[PDB]
Amino acid sequence: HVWVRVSLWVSVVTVAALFGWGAWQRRWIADDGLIVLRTVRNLLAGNGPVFNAGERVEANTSTVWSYLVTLGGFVAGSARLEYVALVLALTLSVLGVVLVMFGTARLYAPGLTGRRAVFLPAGALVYIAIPPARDFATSGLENGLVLAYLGLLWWMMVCWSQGLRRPDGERTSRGFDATLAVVAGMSVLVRPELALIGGLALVMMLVAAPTWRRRLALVVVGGLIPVAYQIFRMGYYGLLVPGTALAKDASGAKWDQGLVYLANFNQPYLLWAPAVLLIGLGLMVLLLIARTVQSPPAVVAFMLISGLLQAVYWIRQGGDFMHGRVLLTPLFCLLAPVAVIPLLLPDRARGAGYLYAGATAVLWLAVAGWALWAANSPGMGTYSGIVDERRFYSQATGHAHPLTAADYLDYPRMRAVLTAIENTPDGALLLPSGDYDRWDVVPALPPPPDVRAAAVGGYVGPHTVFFTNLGMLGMNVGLDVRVIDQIGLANPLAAHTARLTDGRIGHDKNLFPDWAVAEGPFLKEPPWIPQYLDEDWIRQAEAALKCPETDKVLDAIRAPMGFRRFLSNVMHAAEYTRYRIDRVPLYELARCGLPVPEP
Numbered sequence: 001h002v003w004v005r006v007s008l009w010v011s012v013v014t015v016a017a018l019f020g021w022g023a024w025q026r027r028w029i030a031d032d033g034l035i036v037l038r039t040v041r042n043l044l045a046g047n048g049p050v051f052n053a054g055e056r057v058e059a060n061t062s063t064v065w066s067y068l069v070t071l072g073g074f075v076a077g078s079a080r081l082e083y084v085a086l087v088l089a090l091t092l093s094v095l096g097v098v099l100v101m102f103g104t105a106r107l108y109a110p111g112l113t114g115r116r117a118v119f120l121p122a123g124a125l126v127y128i129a130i131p132p133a134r135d136f137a138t139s140g141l142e143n144g145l146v147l148a149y150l151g152l153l154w155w156m157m158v159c160w161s162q163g164l165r166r167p168d169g170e171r172t173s174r175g176f177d178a179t180l181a182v183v184a185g186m187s188v189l190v191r192p193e194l195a196l197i198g199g200l201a202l203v204m205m206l207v208a209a210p211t212w213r214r215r216l217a218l219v220v221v222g223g224l225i226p227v228a229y230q231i232f233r234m235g236y237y238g239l240l241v242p243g244t245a246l247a248k249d250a251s252g253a254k255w256d257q258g259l260v261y262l263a264n265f266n267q268p269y270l271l272w273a274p275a276v277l278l279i280g281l282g283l284m285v286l287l288l289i290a291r292t293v294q295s296p297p298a299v300v301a302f303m304l305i306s307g308l309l310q311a312v313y314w315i316r317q318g319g320d321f322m323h324g325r326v327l328l329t330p331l332f333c334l335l336a337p338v339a340v341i342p343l344l345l346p347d348r349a350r351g352a353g354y355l356y357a358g359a360t361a362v363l364w365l366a367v368a369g370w371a372l373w374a375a376n377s378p379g380m381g382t383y384s385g386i387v388d389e390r391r392f393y394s395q396a397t398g399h400a401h402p403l404t405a406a407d408y409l410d411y412p413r414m415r416a417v418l419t420a421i422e423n424t425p426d427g428a429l430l431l432p433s434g435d436y437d438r439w440d441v442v443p444a445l446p447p448p449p450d451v452r453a454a455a456v457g458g459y460v461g462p463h464t465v466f467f468t469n470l471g472m473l474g475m476n477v478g479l480d481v482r483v484i485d486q487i488g489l490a491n492p493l494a495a496h497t498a499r500l501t502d503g504r505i506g507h508d509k510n511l512f513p514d515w516a517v518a519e520g521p522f523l524k525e526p527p528w529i530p531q532y533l534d535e536d537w538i539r540q541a542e543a544a545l546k547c548p549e550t551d552k553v554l555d556a557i558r559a560p561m562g563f564r565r566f567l568s569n570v571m572h573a574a575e576y577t578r579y580r581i582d583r584v585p586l587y588e589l590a591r592c593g594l595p596v597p598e599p
C-alpha cells in the first residue's frame with residue numbers, strides 16, 4: 001500500500017540525507033586514501049595502473065575503486081583528483097545505504113502484502129550513527145565502494161530469493177540470474193575479503209541450479225571478469241595477491257590481538273547493546289533441496305553468516321591500525337537483514353497482540369535512541385597500534401578537514417620533501433632524519449658527463465623517498481619521483497620481506513633503510529650516507545639483491561611490458577608470490593647463498 005511504500009521511501013531518504021550530511025561534515029582522506037589516488041594519477045598520465053613510473057606494484061586492493069576513481073578523475077576537468085575521491089566515496093556509500101535499505105524492504109515486503117505496516121530504520125541507522133562508518137564514508141578507501149557493493153548484492157540476493165514464483169519453470173529471470181552471478185563474481189575483485197561473500201553467494205546460486213550445464217554456465221558467466229583481471233594481475237604484477245596483502249607473511253592465529261581490537265572498537269560506542277537489541281528485535285519480528293536455498297530465510301542466513309565470517313577473518317588477521325575500517329564491512333553485513341524493521345500488526349485486534357507495537361516500536365526507540373548517542377559519543381582510537389586515523393591526520397596537519405592533497409602538505413615531513421627535491425637537482429634518496437624533521441639526503445650517483453647536456457628540459461636525477469606515510473607523498477612529491485614504503489605498501493622489496501616477531505599490527509615489518517639505499521643510483525660510501533645507517537648492512541643488502549631469485553622477481557615487476565612478459569608473469573606468478581626474503585641482510589646473503597662482502 002502507499003501508506004507503507006511512502007514510509008519506506010521516507011526512511012530511505014532520511015537515512016541517506018543524514019548519512020550524506022555526516023560524510024560531508026567530515027571531509028577526510030587517509031594516507032592510504034591517497035595511495036589510490038597516486039595509482040590512478042599514474043594511470044591517467046599514460047603510465048598504466050601503477051604506483052610509480054616503472055615500479056609495477058599493485059598498492060590498490062580494490063581493483064574497482066581504483067578504476068572508479070580513475071574514471072572520475074578522467075571525466076573531471078579540475079586538476080584535483082581528491083575531489084573526485086570525495087564525491088565518489090560520498091555518492092557510492094549513500095547509494096550502498098539506499099540499496100541495502102531497499103533490499104531489506106523487499107525482504108520484508110511479502111509479509112506486509114495483506115497487512116499495512118510502517119517500516120522504520122534500525123540496524124542500518126545505528127550503522128550510520130557509528131562514528132567510524134561516518135568517518136570512513138568519505139576517504140579514498142573502499143568503504144564507500146564496499147558499502148555500495150554490499151547494498152547492491154543484498155538487494156539482488158533478496159530479489160532472487162523472492163523471485164521463486166515459477167514464471168516458466170526457471171523460478172527466476174535468466175538475465176537477472178546472470179547479472180547477480182556477475183555481481184557475486186565481482187565481489188572477489190572489489191575486496192579480497194569480500195570473496196568470502198562472493199564465494200558463498202555463488203554456491204547458494206549454484207546449488208539452486210538444476211543441471212550441471214546450468215551450474216557451469218552460471219559459474220563461467222558470473223566469474224569471467226574476475227578471472228580475466230586475475231590473469232591481468234598475474235601479468236602486469238606477477239603476483240597472485242594485490243601486493244599489500246603480501247606484505248604480511250604467515251599472518252594468522254592472532255586471536256588475542258584480534259579480540260583486543262574488537263574490544264577497542266566496541267568500547268567507545270558500546271556495540272553490545274545494539275547487537276543484543278537488534279538480535280532480539282529481529283527475532284521478535286520473525287515470530288510472525290534447491291528450493292530451500294533460494295528462500296528469503298536462506299538469504300538472511302547468507303548475510304548473517306557472511307558478516308560473521310568476515311568478522312572472524314578480520315580477527316584472525318588482526319585489525320589494522322585503522323580504528324574500525326576492517327570491522328565496518330562485517331558489521332554492515334550483520335546489520336543488513338535488520339536494516340529496516342516493519343511494525344506489522346499480528347492481525348489475528350483485542351490489544352494482547354497489539355502489545356507487539358508496545359514491544360516492537362519501543363525496541364526501535366531503544367535502537368534509534370542509542371544511535372543518537374552513538375554518533376555524538378567521541379570515538380577513541382594503551383600500547384596497542386589502534387589509532388583513529390582521521391583524528392591523527394587532522395591533528396597532525398594544519399587542518400581539521402584534510403580533504404585535498406594540498407592540505408596534507410602541512411604534515412611535518414611533507415613540506416621538507418618538496419623543499420629538498422627542488423633544492424637538489426641531481427637526484428637524492430630522502431630518508432626521515434633522526435636529528436630533525438627534515439630529510440637526510442643520500443645524494444644520487446652523479447649524472448655522467450654529456451648525459452646532463454643530453455637531457456630535455458635540464459637534467460633531474462632519480463628522487464626516491466623512503467617514508468612510512470605513502471599516499472601523501474604520492475600526491476605531493478610529484479609523478480616522476482619514486483615513492484616507497486618501509487612496510488611494503490608499494491615497495492616490492494619490502495613486501496617480500498619475511499617477519500620474525502608478531503610485534504605491532506600494520507607497522508611491525510619496518511624494512512631497514514639499508515635495503516632502501518641498496519637499490520637505485522645511490523651512493524654507498526660512509527661520508528655521504530647518513531650517519532645513523534650501518535654501512536655493512538648496506539653492502540650486504542646490495543650483494544643480496546643480486547641473487548638470481550630476488551633479481552628475477554624484481555625484473556618481472558619492473559622490466560618493459562610485452563606479450564612475452566605478460567605470459568611469463570602469468571606462468572610464474574605462483575613462484576613469485578611464494579618467495580620470502582629474510583629481513584636481516586646478513587641472513588639473506590646466507591639464505592640466497594652469495595658470499596658476504598668485506599667491510
Ligand SMILES: CC(C)=CCC/C(C)=C/CC/C(C)=C/COP(=O)(O)O[C@@H]1O[C@H](CO)[C@@H](O)[C@@H]1F
Pocket residue numbers: 032033035036059060061062140141142192193194195196241242244245313320489
Ligand atoms: C579471500 C579472503 C576472504 C581472504 C584473503 C584475501 C586477502 C588478500 C585479504 C585482505 C587483504 C588486505 C589485508 C587488504 C588491506 O587493504 P588496505 O590496507 O586497506 O590497503 C591500503 O588501503 C588502500 C585502500 O584499501 C590501499 O591503497 C592501501 F594498500
